Design a protein around this nucleic acid. Sequence first.
DNA 1: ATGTACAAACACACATCAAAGGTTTATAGATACATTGAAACTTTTATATACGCGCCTTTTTTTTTT
Length: 638
Amino acid sequence: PADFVPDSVSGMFRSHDFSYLRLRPDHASRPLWISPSDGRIILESFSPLAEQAQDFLVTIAEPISRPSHIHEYKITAYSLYAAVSVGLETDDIISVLDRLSKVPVAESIINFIKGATISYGKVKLVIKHNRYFVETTQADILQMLLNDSVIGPLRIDSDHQVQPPEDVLEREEEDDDIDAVHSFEIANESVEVVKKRCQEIDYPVLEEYDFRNDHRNPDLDIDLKPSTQIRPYQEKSLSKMFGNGRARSGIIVLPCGAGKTLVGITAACTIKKSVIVLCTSSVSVMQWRQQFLQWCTLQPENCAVFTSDNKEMFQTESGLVVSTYSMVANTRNRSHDSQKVMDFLTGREWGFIILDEVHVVPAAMFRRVVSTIAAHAKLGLTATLVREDDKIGDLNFLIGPKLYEANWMELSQKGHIANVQCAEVWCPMTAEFYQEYLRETARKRMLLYIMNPTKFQACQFLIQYHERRGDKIIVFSDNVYALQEYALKMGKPFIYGSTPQQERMNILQNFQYNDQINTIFLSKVGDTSIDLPEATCLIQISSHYGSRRQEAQRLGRILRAKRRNDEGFNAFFYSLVSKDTQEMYYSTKRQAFLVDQGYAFKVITHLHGMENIPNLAYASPRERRELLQEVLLKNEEA
DNA sequence: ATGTACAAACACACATCAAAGGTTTATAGATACATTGAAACTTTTATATACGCGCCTTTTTTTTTT
């Protein structure tokens, strides 16, 4: 509602029917011919020079970049919406498609492309010279201010004001769209629904949140601080929040943890206003304050963070703020002095708000921040946008769709993010558990899946292989119930939820730079803390449907957060896939976007040498049939 | 429809901190011997003088067995 779904929907514009091709225009003109109606991308015989052409292709659709002449392409509806930042000559892309009119030129698609170039940069929501107003700016969304009632009748005929930009400032459209068809000064009351009304009245309107163009502020408790540096993937995001008129903001999809505070530093530094920051959990947040927050540009003293047990200095500093949603994303609240903090900052006209990895966060709890801050601008930072909660209003119509993707196979040609060759070992199955798996019921069937004799024979082989060629391991699995049994039946450490803080320390200290106790297991809450800077030998064993997304996201921090820049980087991933079992199809459906990312995958049902393992307990299958007798228990508890 | 493993509050059961105190003992006060050198102390005598007292020495009296 306030936000819009439009941030997780790539792979579109595929305009082609049972008779798509028109009289091949590019048939004669063969310098370049992408799939037009689709928006697909394909080179032409009068034109093979590719590498420099990365950017032009970046404007449209999805490639196949292990393609030879070129990679693939596609149309994208909101994709043109993103392109407005440059906002170049619209027909030029069509003019570029002029040669690329491969079939008879799909003017309809071209119009669709002209349409594909309709919204972004054609935004419409008024603003005024140190205030906000009820007008509109570009053709794509112009009326998204003027004809309105929360933007038009919620646009107030006030003439013009920077100093007069405050009383109203039908709430602060300080982040209004492109502005000023006759712009009626914006008010102070009711856009918390406008953001909902927007797509409700479906205005593809390009929000704009300025750098100094709202003098409801003698611009407030920030200031520019640029000390930072840049790896090859920054600047676009930074200038991505400028546009036309006055500045703006948006949403960006990233493998996070890359000093994303630093990019957060800039835009906040570049508005000098009131801003707050948010992260998941005192479980999660502390990987932020002090190894990647001070090599940067901020003074050492200001901010406060709040848990009323992990509390700070509140009622104290005029400067900026930082908190957690789930803290107040709920009627959860520890010390009523929280409501000594709650009321203002909630009610406070924050210039900007920072939300981070809201991906897992549900509307059923995510709407609180929507109902909490309503800051004049917002930060969009999560893991993945194609989702399971693909529901109606994603945070876009609040902030925007994804602004910057990542880049993996050919920009990382500046910085190698950990060359991957994924492995899935296709271990067959025995009916012995499986027979009563044919007798099972609700997901307590899946426990039987965990009862596979094959995992063991391979499990050590993985440990053996890794150390037979001598590189240490990081493993992935689930369902601790017996997976914990696996651990100290693997000769390897056990890790489990519902665990005291004390014991968490003994895991790493005489363990990291040592070279002997070189194996690890993972829980379902421990993954919410950290992964080692070591052992990119990545082995999946056990997972679970739906979690697949975050499970796949869970795999992310290992490699992408790594940045070392060697020649090859012979790194690999591995996984356990017990054959003839309920999940692998869903795992293939999980695999369905594995090499989507270009980070590839190779399969081995059996390698050269899996059986080389003589230390496996249950070497003969009667212990595996002893296992059957233990296999009963929990599934006889079940 | 439909509730379930999973992890955030939210106030609390759990491991920790800290004041108090018997007991031990160097550690020191005070202690009782251990040293020794040092000066305050002893001896002749004879010599008469003019004493006693006890002891040299002896005269007179005093007391058991055949």
